[PDB]
Amino acid sequence: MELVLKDAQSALTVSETTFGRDFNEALVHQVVVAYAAGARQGTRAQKTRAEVTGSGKKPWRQKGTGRARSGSIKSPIWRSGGVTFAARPQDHSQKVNKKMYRGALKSILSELVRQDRLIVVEKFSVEAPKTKLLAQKLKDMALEDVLIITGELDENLFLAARNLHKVDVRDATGIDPVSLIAFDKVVMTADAVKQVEEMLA
Amino acid sequence: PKIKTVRGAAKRFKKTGKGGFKHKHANLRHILTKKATKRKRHLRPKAMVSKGDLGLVIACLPYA
Amino acid sequence: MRLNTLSPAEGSKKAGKRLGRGIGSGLGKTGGRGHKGQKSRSGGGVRRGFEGGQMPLYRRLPKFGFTSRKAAITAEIRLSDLAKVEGGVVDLNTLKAANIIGIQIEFAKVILAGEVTTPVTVRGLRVTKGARAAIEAAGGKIEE
Amino acid sequence: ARVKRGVIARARHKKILKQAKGYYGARSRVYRVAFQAVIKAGQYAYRDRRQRKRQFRQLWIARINAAARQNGISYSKFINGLKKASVEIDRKILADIAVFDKVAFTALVEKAKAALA
RNA sequence: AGCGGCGAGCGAACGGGGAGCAGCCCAGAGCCUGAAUCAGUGUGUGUGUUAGUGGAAGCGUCUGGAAAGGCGCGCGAUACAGGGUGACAGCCCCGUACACAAAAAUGCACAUGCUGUGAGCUCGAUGAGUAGGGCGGGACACGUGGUAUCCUGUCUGAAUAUGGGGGGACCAUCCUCCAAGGCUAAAUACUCCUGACUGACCGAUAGUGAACCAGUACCGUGAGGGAAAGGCGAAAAGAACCCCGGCGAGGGGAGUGAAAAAGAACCUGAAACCGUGUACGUACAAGCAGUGGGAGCACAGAGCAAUCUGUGUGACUGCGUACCUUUUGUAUAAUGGGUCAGCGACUUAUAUUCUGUAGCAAGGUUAACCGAAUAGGGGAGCCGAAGGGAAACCGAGUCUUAA
Numbered sequence: 001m002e003l004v005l006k007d008a009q010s011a012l013t014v015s016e017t018t019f020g021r022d023f024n025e026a027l028v029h030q031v032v033v034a035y036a037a038g039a040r041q042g043t044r045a046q047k048t049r050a051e052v053t054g055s056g057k058k059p060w061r062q063k064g065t066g067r068a069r070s071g072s073i074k075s076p077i078w079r080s081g082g083v084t085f086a087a088r089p090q091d092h093s094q095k096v097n098k099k100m101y102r103g104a105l106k107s108i109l110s111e112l113v114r115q116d117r118l119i120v121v122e123k124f125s126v127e128a129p130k131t132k133l134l135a136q137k138l139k140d141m142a143l144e145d146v147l148i149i150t151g152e153l154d155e156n157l158f159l160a161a162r163n164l165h166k167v168d169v170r171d172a173t174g175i176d177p178v179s180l181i182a183f184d185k186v187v188m189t190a191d192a193v194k195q196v197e198e199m200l201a
Numbered sequence: 202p203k204i205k206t207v208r209g210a211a212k213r214f215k216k217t218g219k220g221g222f223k224h225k226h227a228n229l230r231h232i233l234t235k236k237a238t239k240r241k242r243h244l245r246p247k248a249m250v251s252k253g254d255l256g257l258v259i260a261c262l263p264y265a
Numbered sequence: 266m267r268l269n270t271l272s273p274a275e276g277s278k279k280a281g282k283r284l285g286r287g288i289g290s291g292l293g294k295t296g297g298r299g300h301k302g303q304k305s306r307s308g309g310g311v312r313r314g315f316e317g318g319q320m321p322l323y324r325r326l327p328k329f330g331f332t333s334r335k336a337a338i339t340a341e342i343r344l345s346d347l348a349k350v351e352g353g354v355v356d357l358n359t360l361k362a363a364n365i366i367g368i369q370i371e372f373a374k375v376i377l378a379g380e381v382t383t384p385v386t387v388r389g390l391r392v393t394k395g396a397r398a399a400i401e402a403a404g405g406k407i408e409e
Numbered sequence: 410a411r412v413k414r415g416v417i418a419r420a421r422h423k424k425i426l427k428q429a430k431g432y433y434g435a436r437s438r439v440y441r442v443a444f445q446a447v448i449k450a451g452q453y454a455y456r457d458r459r460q461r462k463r464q465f466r467q468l469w470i471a472r473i474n475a476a477a478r479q480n481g482i483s484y485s486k487f488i489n490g491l492k493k494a495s496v497e498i499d500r501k502i503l504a505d506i507a508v509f510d511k512v513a514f515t516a517l518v519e520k521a522k523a524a525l526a
Numbered sequence: 527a528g529c530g531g532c533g534a535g536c537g538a539a540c541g542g543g544g545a546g547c548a549g550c551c552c553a554g555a556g557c558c559u560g561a562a563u564c565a566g567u568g569u570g571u572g573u574g575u576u577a578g579u580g581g582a583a584g585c586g587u588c589u590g591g592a593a594a595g596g597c598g599c600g601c602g603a604u605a606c607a608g609g610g611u612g613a614c615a616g617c618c619c620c621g622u623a624c625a626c627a628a629a630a631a632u633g634c635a636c637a638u639g640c641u642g643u644g645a646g647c648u649c650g651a652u653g654a655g656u657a658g659g660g661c662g663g664g665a666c667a668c669g670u671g672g673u674a675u676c677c678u679g680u681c682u683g684a685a686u687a688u689g690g691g692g693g694g695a696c697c698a699u700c701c702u703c704c705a706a707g708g709c710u711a712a713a714u715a716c717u718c719c720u721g722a723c724u725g726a727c728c729g730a731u732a733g734u735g736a737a738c739c740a741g742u743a744c745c746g747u748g749a750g751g752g753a754a755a756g757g758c759g760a761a762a763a764g765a766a767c768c769c770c771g772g773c774g775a776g777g778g779g780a781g782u783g784a785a786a787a788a789g790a791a792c793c794u795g796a797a798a799c800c801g802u803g804u805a806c807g808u809a810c811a812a813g814c815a816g817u818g819g820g821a822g823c824a825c826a827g828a829g830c831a832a833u834c835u836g837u838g839u840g841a842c843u844g845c846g847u848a849c850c851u852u853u854u855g856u857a858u859a860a861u862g863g864g865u866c867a868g869c870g871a872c873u874u875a876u877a878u879u880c881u882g883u884a885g886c887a888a889g890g891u892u893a894a895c896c897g898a899a900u901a902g903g904g905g906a907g908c909c910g911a912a913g914g915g916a917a918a919c920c921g922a923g924u925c926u927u928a929a
């Protein structure tokens with residue numbers, strides 16, 4: 001497959017199985033949902049009837065008073081009582097098969113190419129770690145909401161992108177499916193493209 | 202936790218190739234003189250578990 | 266392809282039953298448990314193998330047999346396994362190195378299952394009659 | 410994810426109580442009683458869509474009988490006469506004519522009598 | 527695997543993958559000597575901790591009580607974390623990124639002093655009421671069992687390196703280790719307490735019992751038990767003064783405010799429940815109180831008119847014994863509910879099987895762990911491609927049987 005560079009007006013050769021495969025929406029959906037589940041902290045609890053503070057005294061005798069029978073002041077039927085099925089901290093992460101993760105990434109990148117959201121450049125850098133320089137460069141290339149994948153993380157570029165909230169900067173080994181879908185455009189350097197090709201085989 | 206095998210069932214049933222269970226026949230432990238040789242001979246080979254009992258056996262033997 | 270335009274496959278995500286939520290759900294009130302008895306109760310039910318008190322099947326039948334320690338250290342090898350080892354000589358060590366048999370296997374037997382198409386030398390294993398014919402026909406040899 | 414029930418519960422109870430307007434006492438004020446009254450009203454209405462057809466046919470028949478006997482013939486003979494004359498006007502219309510156009514009704518009676526003779 | 531009224535249940539090890547890793551001393555004399563190693567006490571060098579310092583960049587106009595909002599044109603960003611300001615602020619304020627700071631005390635890591643300690647070589651020595659045994663118990667996954675092994679209340683009792691322990695009854699052989707003296711970091715467990723940060727956690731009947739002067743009020747001889755109770759406004763500008771009233775309570779004006787049915791019994795202000803006003807019905811009429819039919823009256827529209835329609839009421843009339851539960855069967859004189867509002871019951875973890883769906887496919891998949899990594903590594907393992915037989919064993923066959 002041939003991807004046309006934007007800044008050099010040349011062509012780059014990439015694997016058809018990586019950048020030109022069909023979109024498998026069900027597979028991509030599973031991987032994206034598992035990513036969001038992996039982000040969950042799962043930190044919470046309530047108190048069961050065993051953990052509410054109070055004594056185990058029977059509130060009133062089983063029979064004779066004319067009241068419904070009571071056994072615990074901590075009954076979940078009662079105000080101030082326990083929570084019937086009180087939560088505990090949970091681990092929400094899902095397993096994703098290695099081959100399914102890689103397959104989802106290939107589908108996503110191929111869809112980006114088909115939708116013309118993947119832009120390949122020879123180089124992407126700024127002279128100084130200044131937010132204004134990166135803003136001007138993105139304005140020149142007509143980019144607003146963009147994920148930039150470089151072969152080597154340029155410190156100046158990373159620092160310049162920190163305070164721009166529509167813009168993210170990563171190395172090739174740090175790409176993730178949700179970011180690839182979520183940003184309006186994806187800019188990759190040629191070195192990053194080669195690295196991604198090798199990573200996905 | 203892991204389900205626990207009913208060890209007593211594991212001592213009396215074995216799973217066969219298509220997934221049934223073979224077992225040893227009852228009535229061949231003792232009181233043998235009064236039983237006909239034909240009856241005892243037909244009790245010697247192992248048999249398969251019946252359809253109505255397969256569910257109970259399977260419940261007892263999750264790792265069979 | 267956006268975070269709000271992805272859908273799961275049809276049939277992949279059946280909703281769970283929610284008991285005790287009204288007539289229209291079909292599981293209101295008793296929640297499918299029927300009326301009364303031990304099986305309608307919280308924590309209710311009888312243990313595995315219970316039959317109501319009649320001597321259960323797993324106790325009216327007799328125990329049989331013994332378990333052999335030597336079977337636990339004996340393995341079987343397929344013909345298709347022969348080409349998977351490293352070097353063309355098949356023995357206990359090379360099978361273990363190729364992950365065909367477990368580390369504590371002391372005895373192995375090659376059986377006629379699958380095919381062998383390359384010459385191999387089998388050393389120190391037992392070979393079935395059919396497997397020996399297949400190995401020799403493929404051009405290998407068997408050494409005791 | 411704790412869910413408070415108040416907004417939805419209020420809407421449901423309010424729907425029922427709105428259907429209960431005009432009912433007596435607790436039947437228009439108290440959710441437990443209003444709910445039973447709304448259900449029973451629905452059951453009666455289902456039953457009485459069927460009853461309404463019966464009661465109106467019964468009324469039309471009674472009026473036709475009166476008009477026919479004013480004209481000298483019973484209801485049953487009048488109906489048999491119309492059937493023998495191949496007249497297919499139904500009882501709703503025959504009762505309407507009996508009340509509003511007595512001359513036309515007399516003409517129908519004459520047709521029935523001629524068919525019977 | 528085994529243990530087990532072989533019931534209910536209990537449940538290893540060998541071996542493999544990882545984290546972490548470290549070895550020493552006494553039972554003693556001579557030589558050589560004060561030599562490593564730790565422990566303590568000073569002294570310096572770094573590096574934290576305990577106060578702190580600087581920290582970018584916005585105006586005009588519309589709505590409005592008030593602008594941070596709309597519209598227009600600018601500017602900072604290694605700072606668009608977060609909080610506040612009369613509504614939603616990168617540029618008003620406090621911060622934030624970043625860059626700096628310690629008289630004094632103190633933690634850690636090095637370096638360097640002083641004190642104790644001994645380092646190395648040779649020759650020796652090698653833990654006795656002990657091991658083992660009998661009796662009674664206990665611990666071992668192992669319930670006395672064919673029961674090794676460990677501990678010892680009781681009674682006994684070796685060999686000691688040419689010797690002894692173990693290898694699951696026991697013997698022989700072989701292999702392996704050296705009890706009856708002791709020290710030892712790391713990988714592991716926990717959080718009363720301190721700081722920072724986070725949450726598909728709660729949001730006043732919830733969340734701590736306790737958002738509030740709560741382990742209080744109150745209860746109990748005592749141990750002990752144990753509540754309820756949050757919100758005016760942006761700002762008190764918290765209502766000067768007048769009037770009725772007991773120099774009251776309460777209210778009406780006035781004034782403040784965007785708003786006072788925001789006036790402190792204060793945001794919003796539900797429902798049960800209780801009133802005032804209007805329309806219609808109702809004092810000859812028998813019952814789950816509705817429903818089907820339906821006159822008259824009132825009302826709002828429309829129409830030139832005739833009159834029609836929507837709303838309220840409902841004389842008269844057909845039909846008509848609530849709901850839940852439990853039951854063969856309930857108007858049942860069987861059960862439960864005085865009413866409202868709020869809360870109140872099939873969940874969570876792991877294992878296993880079946881269905882759906884997705885990936886890969888005769889293969890599929892990794893666990894702990896490593897990694898800064900939702901990547902990548904890690905295939906230890908687990909399931910599957912072969913079964914038969916109690917088993918040895920044989921194997922697309924095998925078992926049965928002399929066949």
Ligand SMILES: [K+]
Nearest residue numbers: 161162164167
């Ligand atoms: K950024």
Ligand SMILES: [K+]
Nearest residue numbers: 296297298299
């Ligand atoms: K059921």
Ligand SMILES: [K+]
Nearest residue numbers: 437438439798
């Ligand atoms: K009311």
Ligand SMILES: [K+]
Nearest residue numbers: 531533534535
């Ligand atoms: K039992």
Ligand SMILES: [K+]
Nearest residue numbers: 202536537667
């Ligand atoms: K266990």
Ligand SMILES: [K+]
Nearest residue numbers: 587593595596
């Ligand atoms: K403005």
Ligand SMILES: [K+]
Nearest residue numbers: 609610615616
């Ligand atoms: K702000």
Ligand SMILES: [K+]
Nearest residue numbers: 670673674675
């Ligand atoms: K023993």
Ligand SMILES: [K+]
Nearest residue numbers: 658659682683
């Ligand atoms: K002894």
Ligand SMILES: [K+]
Nearest residue numbers: 690691702703
């Ligand atoms: K020995």
Ligand SMILES: [K+]
Nearest residue numbers: 052053054735
């Ligand atoms: K309490």
Ligand SMILES: [K+]
Nearest residue numbers: 079080735753
């Ligand atoms: K409370």
Ligand SMILES: [K+]
Nearest residue numbers: 785788793794
């Ligand atoms: K108000």
Ligand SMILES: [K+]
Nearest residue numbers: 757793794795
């Ligand atoms: K309030």
Ligand SMILES: [K+]
Nearest residue numbers: 787791792795
């Ligand atoms: K009020």
Ligand SMILES: [K+]
Nearest residue numbers: 809810811812
């Ligand atoms: K009378």
